[PDB]
Design a protein around this motif. Sequence first.
Motif, PDB file in Angstrom:
ATOM      1  N   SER B  13      68.627-103.722  32.088  1.00 55.77           N
ATOM      2  CA  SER B  13      69.720-102.982  32.288  1.00 55.77           C
ATOM      3  C   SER B  13      70.470-104.123  32.849  1.00 55.77           C
ATOM      4  N   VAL B  14      71.371-104.923  32.420  1.00 53.42           N
ATOM      5  CA  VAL B  14      72.459-106.311  33.163  1.00 53.42           C
ATOM      6  C   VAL B  14      72.574-105.314  34.438  1.00 53.42           C
ATOM      7  N   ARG B  15      73.622-104.492  34.510  1.00 55.62           N
ATOM      8  CA  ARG B  15      73.932-103.611  35.673  1.00 55.62           C
ATOM      9  C   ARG B  15      74.037-103.063  36.412  1.00 55.62           C
ATOM     10  N   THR B  16      72.417-102.291  36.269  1.00 59.05           N
ATOM     11  CA  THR B  16      71.641-101.354  36.973  1.00 59.05           C
ATOM     12  C   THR B  16      70.629-102.873  37.874  1.00 59.05           C
ATOM     13  N   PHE B  17      70.359-104.383  37.332  1.00 59.76           N
ATOM     14  CA  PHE B  17      68.587-105.021  37.980  1.00 59.76           C
ATOM     15  C   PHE B  17      69.031-105.534  38.688  1.00 59.76           C
ATOM     16  N   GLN B  18      70.073-106.736  39.090  1.00 63.24           N
ATOM     17  CA  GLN B  18      70.638-106.828  40.341  1.00 63.24           C
ATOM     18  C   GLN B  18      71.751-107.818  39.773  1.00 63.24           C
ATOM     19  N   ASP B  19      72.995-107.050  41.396  1.00 59.92           N
ATOM     20  CA  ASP B  19      73.809-107.705  41.750  1.00 59.92           C
ATOM     21  C   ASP B  19      74.305-108.749  42.542  1.00 59.92           C
ATOM     22  N   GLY B  20      74.972-110.141  41.766  1.00 57.57           N
ATOM     23  CA  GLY B  20      75.201-111.187  42.074  1.00 57.57           C
ATOM     24  C   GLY B  20      75.605-111.499  43.788  1.00 57.57           C
ATOM     25  N   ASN B  21      77.104-110.838  42.748  1.00 59.05           N
ATOM     26  CA  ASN B  21      78.517-111.098  43.969  1.00 59.05           C
ATOM     27  C   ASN B  21      78.385-110.400  45.207  1.00 59.05           C
ATOM     28  N   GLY B  22      77.942-109.033  45.111  1.00 59.80           N
ATOM     29  CA  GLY B  22      78.334-107.838  45.912  1.00 59.80           C
ATOM     30  C   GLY B  22      79.087-106.696  45.760  1.00 59.80           C
ATOM     31  N   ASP B  23      79.447-106.459  44.246  1.00 63.23           N
ATOM     32  CA  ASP B  23      80.528-105.258  44.610  1.00 63.23           C
ATOM     33  C   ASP B  23      79.584-104.358  43.329  1.00 63.23           C
ATOM     34  N   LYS B  25      77.228-104.043  41.384  1.00 65.96           N
ATOM     35  CA  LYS B  25      76.696-103.692  40.006  1.00 65.96           C
ATOM     36  C   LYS B  25      75.915-104.964  39.513  1.00 65.96           C
ATOM     37  N   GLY B  26      74.656-105.037  39.372  1.00 65.88           N
ATOM     38  CA  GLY B  26      74.244-106.200  38.022  1.00 65.88           C
ATOM     39  C   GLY B  26      74.956-106.754  37.057  1.00 65.88           C
ATOM     40  N   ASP B  27      74.857-108.640  37.933  1.00 69.24           N
ATOM     41  CA  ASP B  27      75.750-109.327  36.951  1.00 69.24           C
ATOM     42  C   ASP B  27      74.465-110.367  36.438  1.00 69.24           C
ATOM     43  N   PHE B  28      74.947-110.719  35.574  1.00 69.91           N
ATOM     44  CA  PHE B  28      74.600-112.015  34.656  1.00 69.91           C
ATOM     45  C   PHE B  28      73.626-113.007  36.087  1.00 69.91           C
ATOM     46  N   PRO B  29      75.020-113.626  36.318  1.00 70.31           N
ATOM     47  CA  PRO B  29      74.302-114.453  37.408  1.00 70.31           C
ATOM     48  C   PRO B  29      73.229-114.022  38.434  1.00 70.31           C
ATOM     49  N   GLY B  30      73.287-112.574  39.014  1.00 66.80           N
ATOM     50  CA  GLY B  30      71.956-112.069  39.668  1.00 66.80           C
ATOM     51  C   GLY B  30      70.962-112.168  38.968  1.00 66.80           C
ATOM     52  N   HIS B  70      81.452-107.606  29.427  1.00 66.65           N
ATOM     53  CA  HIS B  70      81.633-107.220  29.645  1.00 66.65           C
ATOM     54  C   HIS B  70      82.264-107.041  31.880  1.00 66.65           C
ATOM     55  N   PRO B  71      83.120-106.988  31.818  1.00 65.98           N
ATOM     56  CA  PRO B  71      83.471-107.737  33.568  1.00 65.98           C
ATOM     57  C   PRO B  71      83.020-107.211  34.586  1.00 65.98           C
ATOM     58  N   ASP B  72      82.261-106.799  33.901  1.00 71.37           N
ATOM     59  CA  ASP B  72      80.684-105.624  35.601  1.00 71.37           C
ATOM     60  C   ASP B  72      80.134-106.734  35.747  1.00 71.37           C
ATOM     61  N   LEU B  73      79.427-107.229  34.176  1.00 70.95           N
ATOM     62  CA  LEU B  73      77.958-107.969  34.408  1.00 70.95           C
ATOM     63  C   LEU B  73      79.110-109.377  34.770  1.00 70.95           C
ATOM     64  N   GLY B  74      79.287-110.081  34.661  1.00 66.57           N
ATOM     65  CA  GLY B  74      80.086-111.162  34.432  1.00 66.57           C
ATOM     66  C   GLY B  74      81.112-111.998  33.611  1.00 66.57           C
ATOM     67  N   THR B  75      80.715-113.397  33.261  1.00 65.70           N
ATOM     68  CA  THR B  75      81.947-113.964  32.462  1.00 65.70           C
ATOM     69  C   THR B  75      80.544-114.408  31.242  1.00 65.70           C
ATOM     70  N   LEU B  76      81.305-114.921  30.253  1.00 61.12           N
ATOM     71  CA  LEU B  76      80.582-115.489  29.106  1.00 61.12           C
ATOM     72  C   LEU B  76      79.560-116.539  29.534  1.00 61.12           C
ATOM     73  N   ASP B  77      80.779-117.781  30.723  1.00 62.98           N
ATOM     74  CA  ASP B  77      80.400-118.620  31.249  1.00 62.98           C
ATOM     75  C   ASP B  77      78.834-118.310  31.539  1.00 62.98           C
ATOM     76  N   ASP B  78      79.022-116.882  32.527  1.00 64.99           N
ATOM     77  CA  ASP B  78      77.203-116.339  33.149  1.00 64.99           C
ATOM     78  C   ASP B  78      76.408-116.699  31.974  1.00 64.99           C
ATOM     79  N   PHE B  79      77.482-115.624  30.821  1.00 68.20           N
ATOM     80  CA  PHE B  79      75.812-115.536  29.720  1.00 68.20           C
ATOM     81  C   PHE B  79      75.061-116.795  29.367  1.00 68.20           C
ATOM     82  N   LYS B  80      76.185-117.597  28.928  1.00 74.68           N
ATOM     83  CA  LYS B  80      75.429-118.863  28.401  1.00 74.68           C
ATOM     84  C   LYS B  80      74.501-119.566  29.480  1.00 74.68           C
ATOM     85  N   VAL B  81      74.726-119.926  30.878  1.00 72.93           N
ATOM     86  CA  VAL B  81      73.514-120.389  31.703  1.00 72.93           C
ATOM     87  C   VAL B  81      72.474-119.607  31.615  1.00 72.93           C
TER      88      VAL B  81
END
Lengths: 548, 548
Positions: B13-23, B25-30, B70-81
């Motif tokens: 689950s992206v929310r739970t797996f790795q926070d990249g930004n510091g808030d 909440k696990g995001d796609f960049p993480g 979902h904005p918690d997980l970051g952007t569609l940009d992030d999903f692409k990468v």
Amino acid sequence: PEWYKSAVFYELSVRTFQDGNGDGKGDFPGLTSRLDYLKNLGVDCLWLLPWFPSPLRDDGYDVADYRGIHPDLGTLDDFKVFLREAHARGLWVIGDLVTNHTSSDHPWFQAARRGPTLPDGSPNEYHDYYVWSDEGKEYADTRIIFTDTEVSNWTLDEQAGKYYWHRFFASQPDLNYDNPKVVEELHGAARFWLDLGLDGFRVDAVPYLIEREGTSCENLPETHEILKGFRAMVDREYPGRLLLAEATQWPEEVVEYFGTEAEPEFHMCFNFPVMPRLYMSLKREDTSSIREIMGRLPKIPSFGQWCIFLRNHDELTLEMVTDDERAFMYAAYAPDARMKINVGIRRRLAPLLDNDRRRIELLNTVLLALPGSPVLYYGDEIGMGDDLGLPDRNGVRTPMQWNAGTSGGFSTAQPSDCFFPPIQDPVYGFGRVNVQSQLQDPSSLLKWTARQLELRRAHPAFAHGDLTFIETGNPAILAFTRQYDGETLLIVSNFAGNAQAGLLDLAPFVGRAPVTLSGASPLPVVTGNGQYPVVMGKYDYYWLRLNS
Amino acid sequence: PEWYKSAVFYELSVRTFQDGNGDGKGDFPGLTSRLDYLKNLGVDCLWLLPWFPSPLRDDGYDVADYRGIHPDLGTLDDFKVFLREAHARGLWVIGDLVTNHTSSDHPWFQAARRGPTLPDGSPNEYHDYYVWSDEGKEYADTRIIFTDTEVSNWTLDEQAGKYYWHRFFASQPDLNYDNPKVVEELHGAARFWLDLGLDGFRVDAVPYLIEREGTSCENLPETHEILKGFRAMVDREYPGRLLLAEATQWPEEVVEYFGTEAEPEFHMCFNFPVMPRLYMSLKREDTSSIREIMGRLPKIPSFGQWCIFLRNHDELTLEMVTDDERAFMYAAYAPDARMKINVGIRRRLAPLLDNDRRRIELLNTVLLALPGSPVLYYGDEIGMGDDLGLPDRNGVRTPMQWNAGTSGGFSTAQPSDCFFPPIQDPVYGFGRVNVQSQLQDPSSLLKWTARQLELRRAHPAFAHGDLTFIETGNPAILAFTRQYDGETLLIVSNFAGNAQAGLLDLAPFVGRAPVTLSGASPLPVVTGNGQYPVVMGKYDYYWLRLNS
Ligand SMILES: [Ca+2]
Ligand SMILES: [Ca+2]
Ligand SMILES: [Mg+2]
Ligand SMILES: [Mg+2]
């Protein structure tokens, strides 16, 4: 049966077990406060590392007063409270008796180095406590135990202008055991702790007492005659006490330290011979050396009991293996140069075994299944690691890891301020390896160890039985029976890292029904010729009983 | 064979797996930074938990939008990468396509609750996207899935003066598949994603998206028909993309979700029937119900592949077992009342088994050795625990324990500031249980899990072979062959906590030798009547090969 024959022993160092006053050093009130842990583990006898005044050059094996408690550790009253609290729970306590040498700070040596004639011309009665040569040329060809530190067993004292003898560090001059006065000094030192209720001694470095030109100066008959008199004194003045010998010798020499029925010597002797072989077999997947070295050990006298061990506070000693076995052990268990010291490997049990709990469990079951009483190295029961950045053998003496808090609960002093630093690395540090964690973890190594001593405790054949290897037809599978007072146990262990088969020769037991000792799951009755097939998984251990 | 039959699936689950930004909440960049770890672990395909914008009244399965991030997980940009990197290493990524219902906050309900006609007079096209009911008596003979929370499946809305249907939560209004503009909108849901690089979807709650009177409103023939469309739509337009279905039913009723050769439904379907009898047979030390439930599966189509699992983001469902079996399970695996929920048990895998690594390793073997493609639930490869002070099933969804720093390395936010709190307790907490530690520890459960993946990948009869159970004469010992391409695996597993003897039925292989898959140590040659005797120690697994 004497109490040591049924005792589980636990080796700890006071300076390193529990700090009770924040200075970073273990002490007797800290140990006292932890006796419940030792008792609920299944431990019956605490063996304490030296607790005497000492500069600590060999960590307290350089005694500067045989009759005090060292200021780091508390007072002679603290020791009296500890000894009383340990006895109330049914623990025995033994101490560590440094017979061979003192510290160069011992008042005896400070008086001896003043020459045979004290400056007012009368004879210096202490000069003779120690072993002196004009040019240090006697006892040549004798070997050097501390190979990485000392270059000669002789050293020149600047104020006596003679050489003195030391089998260990230059700060630890050998005592002179041809001087009757020296014999009484130590009988008297033993008397001072035995009078206070101590249950006996581990007796340190006993093969090296007496030196003779033209000999190796090990195992000399004069040395045995002295040790016989120590036992004759204990036997008369303190019935029931325990004398336990440290002697890393080959089998035909080790067994002599028991003496004979007519001339008893020690009650117990560490089984140094088997210990290296446990590790070799594991790495070769071939257990024959275990059987071979065991079969070289003579029957011991009626009062005698071996003390079995896996690791202690010293390096893993390769002093008493062949040149090739030694070389094989260095390649398998000492891949880095920093891992070795004086013909040994200076690593803890768990890192020796790649942290593989299965291997830890296997050897720990071999430790509990051989004839003898087992000794546990403190902290091995939670899987403690080593700190090989520390000098000499200090790396296997880091502080006990009680919890995940400040300095693993050892001290409220910071890690850098403890006597030795408590391990913090991601594998073996106190955040991951600690007693608190493992008391709450249902399947911890601590709970296993306790459960497995509980298991041992319920079958006296483990403590008092004979021993009979069983042919298995696969060198990976070690098998033996332990027989006592009816019960027959059959113990089967696989030293290979994968599954193995064997043909156990149970011809003497045809028509018997093996059962697991844990839960009595039944195995096929032995029938026919008794050649009994078994399969085993990697490092498995079978604790069975043969029902008739 | 197609890529799904031969792949290792990892649930996260992206929310739970790795926070990249510091808030917290696990995001796609993480997640994207931890792709190497998944690669080196030996995982082929990441199955993600809903990443779509939501109120999260059911961690993303109350979907408010089907076509955004979902904005918690970051952007569609992030999903692409992210999907570019997963593919740049050989990783397939599937998604969670939630079908039978949406979030009550989804525009199509917001619009639909305004009534069957707009105030201006024009029929509300959206009102019939969802199921409605004037007096809520339509569909009684039905069970409520969430029996702890919902009293009935009908929920009287206010603004639409009407009941509406939900098989789950009142905030998840069920969807109407007697409407064809619905069906289109969920074929169009898919099209959005598969067009960017996605490789397939797990399909949520398949057995419930068509309802009709007089029945059980699960597994209705009308329901399977739509699914066939989805498969048809996908075969036609997106060849070589996966469909996997949550079908917690009794076996024969599940097999139906595969389709037939003629008209085909799902490639892949979670083998819910077997997953509980694993746990049952361990406690019972009696595998008989593992066979029985595999012996009650019908053969499946060609393209068809079971998905095997032990645990996942939900509780351990007990919905499809007998009432005798569901009581024993609770008695064995839910000692505390608050561990149950919705006819299930909400504990993680390591706590379910007493943190006993032997048991953990065992079920993992049987996982990887039963016919299917296995899915590992994140964190189970390190032995993570569960936090029952979280509501619903969020107790088994805590942050990935990466190391021993701030919040287990999952975020730089403190534990109070993470979407869910990491686990800190003495046993399962991240100071003891983390990836860094287990990367560095030669014998960690992490390295064991990837060693056993390496070992599954050298023997393709695991993914592709058939399956034949073997008689053992002892219900504790489960054994079976897996043949494919002139290679035969013999998989022998003991579910008892003590040693067990068996008599394996190997008559078809007289004159063959079993050899370990690991290390190639051969066992004795099957002879005679092929009644091959064995002994096993607690929780042993033997992974063998039978040579011609
Ligand atoms: Ca000496
Ligand atoms: Ca529906
Ligand atoms: Mg202190
Ligand atoms: Mg974040």
